[PDB]
C-alpha cells in the first residue's frame, strides 16, 4: 500500500482577509493554510479545479506535493470547508507531513454484497479514525455483507484493515447494523 | 399453436380449455378421448399438452413429461407449494428423486447431461422454497 | 384533448413536441393527446 | 460490451481456432432459437457451433493465415469448428441447410486453404 504524492501548484497569498478570500474564490482559486509540526504557518492559494480533481480521484485524505515557489512540500488534506448550498470548497487546511510519520485520519467505510433478502442494512458510521503512516493511508475501507441473518451487528473491531494501520477508536463503535426488514404495517407507526 | 395444462384423467372442463379450444378451430371430443386414453396409460400426473393446428382444422397434440412443479410436489409429499419460498420451507427432497426427475426432464429438456436437468429441478424447487438434499 | 398546465408522456409511445409555441403531447392512443394551456 | 471484452473474445476465438482442424463459415439469417438449439444438439456432442462479430473474427483471423477469409465476413457469420474429426460438422451443416432452406454455406477452411460452396460439397463427400 504505497501512494504517490499529487502535484499541485500553490501561491503565497499577498493579502489575507474576507475581501481577498472572496476575490480569490471568484478567480477560480481556493484559499488554504499550510501548517504542521514545523511551527510555521503559510497562507496559500490553490487552483480550485485541480484540487477538486485530486479529491475526486483520491478521496478527502489525499497526500499532496505542493510547489511553493520552487520548493516541494509534502502535505495532507487535514480539513475542508464545503458550502452547504453551493457545495464549493471555501477553504483548505493542509498538514505538514514527512515520510515515515504516523498520523490520525478519518477513513470512510463503504459496504457491498447482498444480505438475506428479508433484511435491511443500515450504516451508522460514515467514517472511522485510524493511526497510519503518512504515505500509507488507505483510500477507503470496505465491509462485505452476505448471508447475514436477522439482527447482526458489525462493530469497529470486526472491520478488516490493511497491514501497518492501527485502529484507534474503541471497537464498540457500531458501524453497520443488519435488521429484519420492516413490514408493510411497520412503516405506519414511526413518525405518527 | 397453443399450450395448456390439464388433469390427466379428466376431460372437458369449462373454465380452462373449453372456450380456449373453441376459438382455435380444434375438434374437442376427439382430442378429449385420445388425451384421456393417453393419460390413463400414464395415469400418474396432470400433464401439459401443446396443440398444433393446420389449415384443414386438423389438430396434433403433443404430450410433454409431467411438469417439474407437479413432479417435485408429488416427490416431496406436499400438495401446494410454498407461499413464501426461501423463507418458509415446507418439504425436503433427496438427490434420488432429483435425479429421477432429472432423467424425466432430460427426456423433456435440451440439457446435454443429467446433471444440468438436476440443477434445473433444484432451481424449480428453489422457486418452490423446498430444500434439495 | 387534455388542456393542462402540466403535460407529461403518460406512456412510452407519447412524444413531447412544440407547435406554434405550445408544448404538446402526441401519441397513437387518442387519450394521451394533451396540450399546455 | 467493453473493448477489453472484445480483446478477450478475440483471444478466445483464436484459441478455439488453433485447436480446430477445419472451420465452416455459413449464413443463418431466418432461423429461430429452437432451430439453433437443435443444431447445437446435433453438433455439441463432437463439433462446436458459434456466431461472432465479423470484425472481431477479422482481428482474431490475423493470428494465422486465415486472413484470406475476410471476404466471407460480408453478411451474417456463423462459424463451425471441428474439435472431433474435420467433416462431421460439414455434413451436419449441409443437412441442416437442406432441411431448413434458410441456411447459405458461405465457405470452408481446410488444409490451410479457403474453399467455396461446390468445393466444400465435394470435400464432405470424401
Amino acid at each position: 500500500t504505497a501512494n504517490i504524492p499529487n502535484k499541485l501548484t500553490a501561491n503565497v497569498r499577498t493579502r489575507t482577509g474576507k475581501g481577498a478570500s472572496r476575490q480569490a474564490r471568484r478567480d477560480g482559486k481556493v484559499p488554504a493554510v499550510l501548517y504542521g509540526h514545523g511551527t510555521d504557518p503559510q497562507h496559500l492559494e490553490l487552483n480550485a479545479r485541480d484540487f477538486a480533481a485530486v479529491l475526486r480521484s483520491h478521496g478527502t485524505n489525499a497526500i499532496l506535493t505542493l510547489d511553493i515557489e520552487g520548493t516541494e512540500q509534502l502535505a495532507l488534506t487535514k480539513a475542508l470547508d464545503v458550502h452547504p448550498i453551493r457545495r464549493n470548497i471555501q477553504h483548505a487546511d493542509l498538514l505538514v507531513v514527512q515520510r515515515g510519520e504516523k498520523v490520525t485520519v478519518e477513513v470512510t467505510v463503504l459496504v457491498e454484497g447482498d444480505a438475506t433478502p428479508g433484511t435491511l442494512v443500515t450504516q451508522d458510521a460514515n467514517t472511522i479514525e485510524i493511526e497510519a503512516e503518512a504515505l500509507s493511508i488507505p483510500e477507503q475501507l470496505t465491509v462485505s455483507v452476505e448471508g447475514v441473518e436477522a439482527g447482526t451487528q458489525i462493530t469497529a473491531g470486526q472491520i478488516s484493515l490493511p497491514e501497518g494501520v492501527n485502529l484507534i477508536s474503541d471497537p464498540e463503535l457500531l458501524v453497520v447494523n443488519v435488521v429484519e426488514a420492516p413490514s408493510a404495517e411497520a412503516l405506519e407507526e414511526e413518525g405518527a | 399453436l397453443i399450450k395448456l395444462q390439464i388433469q390427466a384423467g379428466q376431460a372437458n372442463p369449462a373454465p380452462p380449455v373449453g372456450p380456449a379450444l373453441g376459438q382455435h378451430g380444434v375438434n374437442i371430443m376427439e382430442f378429449c378421448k385420445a388425451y384421456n386414453a393417453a393419460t390413463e396409460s400414464q395415469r400418474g400426473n396432470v400433464i401439459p399438452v401443446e396443440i398444433t393446428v393446420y389449415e384443414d382444422r386438423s389438430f396434433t397434440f403433443a404430450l410433454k413429461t409431467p411438469p417439474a412443479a407437479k413432479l417435485l410436489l408429488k416427490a416431496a409429499g406436499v400438495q401446494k407449494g410454498s407461499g413464501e419460498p426461501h423463507k418458509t420451507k415446507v418439504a425436503k427432497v433427496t438427490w434420488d428423486q432429483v435425479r429421477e426427475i432429472a432423467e424425466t426432464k432430460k427426456a423433456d429438456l435440451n440439457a446435454n447431461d443429467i446433471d444440468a436437468a438436476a440443477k434445473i429441478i433444484a432451481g424449480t424447487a428453489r422457486s418452490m422454497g423446498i430444500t434439495v438434499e | 384533448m387534455k388542456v393542462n398546465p402540466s403535460v407529461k408522456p403518460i406512456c412510452d409511445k407519447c412524444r413531447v413536441i412544440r407547435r406554434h409555441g405550445r408544448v404538446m403531447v402526441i401519441c397513437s392512443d387518442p387519450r394521451h393527446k394533451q396540450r399546455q394551456g | 460490451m467493453a473493448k477489453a471484452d472484445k480483446a478477450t473474445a478475440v483471444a478466445d476465438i483464436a484459441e478455439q481456432f488453433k485447436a480446430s482442424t477445419a472451420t465452416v463459415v455459413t449464413e443463418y439469417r431466418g432461423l429461430t432459437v429452437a432451430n439453433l438449439a437443435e443444431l447445437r444438439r446435433a453438433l455439441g456432442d463432437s463439433a462446436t457451433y458459434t456466431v461472432a462479430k465479423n470484425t472481431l473474427v477479422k482481428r482474431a483471423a490475423s493470428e494465422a493465415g486465415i486472413e484470406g477469409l475476410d471476404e466471407l465476413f460480408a453478411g451474417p457469420t456463423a462459424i463451425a469448428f471441428v474439435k472431433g474429426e474435420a467433416v462431421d460438422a460439414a455434413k451436419a451443416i449441409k443437412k441442416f441447410a437442406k432441411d431448413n432452406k434458410a441456411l447459405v454455406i458461405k465457405g470452408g477452411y481446410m488444409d490451410g486453404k479457403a474453399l467455396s460452396v461446390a468445393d466444400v460439397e465435394k470435400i464432405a463427400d470424401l
Binding site: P84, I85, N126, A192 | - | - | -
Partner: protein
C-alpha cells in the same frame, strides 16, 4: 401528527427567517435525503402527508428518518375579531426550516424508487427542495 408533549411557554414569538442553516445540513442516517432551499415554517401535517407519501411509494422495505420536529407553536385569534385583547390561542405547530437543512432521510435498496418516493415527498412541501446523497 407530531406534537410536543409539553412546552415551557405556550405563546411565543415567530421563529425568525434570517440566515441559512448551520446544523443538520448533511445526510447522516439514511442513504438519500431531502435538502431544503427556502426559508419556511413547515407544519406537522405537511410532515405527516410527506411521510405517508414516502411510505406508500416504498411499501415494505427501507426506513424513513424525520430530522425535523414541529415544536414551535403559532396562534390565531378567533374569527371575526377586532384588533386587541391579547394574544390568541395556539393551534398549529411548525418547525423553522432554513436553506441547507436536511428534512427527510430514506434508506432503500434501489436508486430509482428511492428518488421517486423522495420526489413524491417534495411535491407535498411549501419549499423548493433537492435530493442529496451520502457522497460528497
Amino acid at each position: 401528527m407530531l406534537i410536543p408533549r409539553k412546552v415551557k411557554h405556550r405563546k411565543q414569538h415567530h421563529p425568525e427567517q434570517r440566515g441559512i442553516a448551520s446544523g443538520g445540513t448533511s445526510v447522516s442516517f439514511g442513504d438519500y435525503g431531502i435538502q431544503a432551499l427556502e426559508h419556511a415554517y413547515i407544519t406537522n401535517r405537511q410532515i405527516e402527508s410527506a411521510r405517508i407519501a414516502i411510505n406508500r411509494h416504498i411499501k415494505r422495505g427501507g426506513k424513513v428518518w424525520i430530522n425535523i420536529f414541529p415544536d414551535r407553536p403559532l396562534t390565531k385569534k378567533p374569527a371575526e375579531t377586532r384588533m386587541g385583547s391579547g394574544k390568541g390561542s395556539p393551534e398549529w405547530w411548525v418547525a423553522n426550516v432554513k436553506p441547507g437543512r436536511v428534512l427527510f432521510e430514506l434508506s432503500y435498496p434501489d436508486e430509482k424508487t428511492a428518488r421517486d418516493a423522495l420526489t413524491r415527498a417534495i411535491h407535498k412541501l411549501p419549499i423548493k427542495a433537492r435530493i442529496v446523497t451520502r457522497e460528497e
